[PDB]
Amino acid sequence: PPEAEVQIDRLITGRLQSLQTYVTQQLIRAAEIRASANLAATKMSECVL
């Protein structure tokens, strides 16, 4: 246990950082998509309707 715990904390921290990085990138990309969707909605109203 004592030694394993040290090695495991190194892996947990790293694994957790990878997940946080993933989420941050998804939030940024989601914002870009939302802007596109808002534009598409505007076009639907002003070009189609």
Add this chain to the structure above:
Amino acid sequence: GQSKRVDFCGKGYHLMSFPQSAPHGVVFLHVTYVPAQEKNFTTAPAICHD
């Protein structure tokens, strides 16, 4: 002003708007004109006279 953009300032034909304040934001009251009762008429592209 008066907008001509479809659905930009509410549904129907926009006439005018009035802002109201709110915590952390703005609320708009949009006044529009909406066609109501309607009738079915015959039509034609042109009238021939002489």
